[PDB]
Amino acid sequence: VKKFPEGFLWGVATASYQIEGSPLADGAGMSIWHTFSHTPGNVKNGDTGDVACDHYNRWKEDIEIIEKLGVKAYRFSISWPRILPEGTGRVNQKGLDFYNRIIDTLLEKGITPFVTIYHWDLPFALQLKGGWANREIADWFAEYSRVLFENFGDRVKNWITLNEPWVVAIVGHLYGVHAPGMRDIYVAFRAVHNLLRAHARAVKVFRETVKDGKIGIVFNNGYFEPASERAVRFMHQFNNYPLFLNPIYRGDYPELVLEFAREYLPENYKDDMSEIQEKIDFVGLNYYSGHLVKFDPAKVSFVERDLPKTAMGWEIVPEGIYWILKKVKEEYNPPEVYITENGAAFDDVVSEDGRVHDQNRIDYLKAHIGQAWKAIQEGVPLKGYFVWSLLDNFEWAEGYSKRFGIVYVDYSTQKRIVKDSGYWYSNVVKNNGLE
Ligand SMILES: OC[C@@H]1[C@@H](O)[C@H](O)[C@@H](O)c2[nH]c(CCc3ccccc3)c[n+]21
């Protein structure tokens, strides 16, 4: 038996473009994920977020699933171009109304909204002006965030500026695998820097607008282990929270990031560091897998290990979640931490019995929840844990071919089938831990 602290926030998480569909409904502007996925060759099977889980219509049912499962928190994101179709200036009341209804429904059901302000669907109109490459995005983002705080901050008290700014910068602008699909290392590091400035500006406005709320930021993290007996030190500093937390807490990028990337950063990047240090209330960590890592003349390659893997091909390494939780306290001692995403893709099928017997996912969640428990026992101020995801959904460049949900979605009918893992999780939430 592993019981969690009183009032521990058990959650599930989604993102607007991945679940909503109807990207252009009710006066919404195009996002970069709309244009990226409608470009041939970018997404597996030519899949797009045009329909997705149709959450844009089915939102009430979906929240009723959250309620029935007894889940206590919902992390969801807001589509920037639903709110400001051109990115700045005009505010679309119908986009505000869409999320207002979600927010009021969650509150009425006593479910705590965690709102991710940016989970990757930049307005296309701002991408035309360079998007994350343009320093002015700190102003655009601040204006957007202000709108959200002004309209929703009376009810929503827990806010996340950015989901996984490393992914946004590097996967979007160096690897070219995500929107806006670019491969320029100088643009990618200017996006890193501008994401920090935009984050800090948004926190600054939050303090002026929502005096009773909490705001944080979310980072992706891998558990990197050395193949033999430094490449690990670099992967952690670059791929994990330190890329952003070293600026936020210490006023500079980490040491091995500067060694590799100084030339790609703006020359006078330090001038912005004072503002980047804006105080945050919590850190969200997303964690999924581990990686065997070796020097290789970025001077690092991964090494395949046996290990059970998910359908993503991601090595299942549960002690990784413990390690990253301990490590973030050891390095930056944030006052609160949340696991804002943890989950697994498996090749789910509906059995003849009408059920989805995803024991593989139960095993994955159970193992990680157990390790997060361990971290709490050794003093990590973990305040919550969010399963990625409530629903099978549009998995970015993998399209619909990867299912991460604890609820199965039959996309032909939009039927939701609660998976064994969903039922299992509901029991964990009800009991406030494992047994
Ligand atoms: O891959 C599953 C989930 C996504 O559906 C979420 O939107 C996103 O927040 C998220 N981040 C990660 C870990 C970082 C990552 C992103 C993209 C590709 C590979 C790793 C895994 N996930």
Q: Which DSSP string do the residues of 293-351 spell out, in sequence order?
A: EEE----EEEE---S-B-TT--B--THHHHHHHHHHHHHH--S-EEEEEE---------
Taking CA atoms, 32 is separated from 118, 120, 291, in Å, by: 12, 8, 30
Q: Which two tokens stand for residue 61?
A: 């049912």
Distance CA 350, CA 414 (A): 14
Q: Which atom of ligand 1 is closest in space to residue 178's alpha carbon? A: 17
- Name the DSSP letter for residue 117: E
- Asked whether 290 and 268 are in contact (CB, 8 A), the reply is no
Please indicate whether residue 278 is annotated as part of the active site. Answer: no
Catalytic annotation, pick one of 225, 315, 331, 341: 341
Q: How far is the CA of 324 from the centre of ligand 1 (A)?
A: 17
Distance CA 172, CA 229 (A): 33
> Burial letters for 375-413: b for 16+ Cβ neighbours within 10 Å, e otherwise?
bbeeebbbbbbbbbbbbbbbbbbebbebbbbbbbbeeee
Q: To the nearest 10°, the Cα dihedral for 238, 268, 187, 190?
A: 60
- Asked whether 112 and 106 are in contact (CB, 8 A), the reply is yes
Q: Is 274 exposed, middle or buried (0-12, 13-18, 19+ CB in 10 A)?
A: exposed
Ligand 1 atom 16 nearest Cα: 167
Method used experimentally: X-ray
Q: How far is the CA of 381 from the centre of ligand 1 (A)?
A: 24
Q: Which atom of ligand 1 is closest in space to residue 396's alpha carbon? A: 5
Q: Which residue has the tokens 């007996």?
A: 229
Q: How far is the CA of 141 from the centre of ligand 1 (A)?
A: 22
Taking CA atoms, 335 is separated from 202, 251, 406, 430, in Å, by: 19, 18, 30, 26
Taking CA atoms, 422 is separated from 17, 158, 240, in Å, by: 22, 24, 28
**What 3-state class would DSSP assign to 199?**
helix
Q: Which two tokens stand for residue 315?
A: 């090595």
Taking CA atoms, 149 is separated from 144, 193, 204, 382, in Å, by: 9, 23, 12, 25
Please indicate whether residue 319 is annotated as part of the active site. Answer: no
CATH of domain 1-435: 3.20.20.80
Say what the resolution is, in angstroms: 2.0
- Give the E-state strand segments of 96-195 in sequence order: 112-118, 158-163
**Bridge partner residues of 285 (DSSP):** 219, 339
- Residue 77: HSE in the Cβ half-sphere, 13 Å Cα cutoff: 29
Q: Which residue has the tokens 């019981």?
A: 3
Q: Which residues line ligand 1 (CB under 6 A)?
A: 15, 18, 163-164, 167, 171, 220, 286, 288, 341, 388, 395, 404
The residues, ordered by sequence, that sit 6+ positions from 262 with a Cβ below 8 Å of its Cβ are none
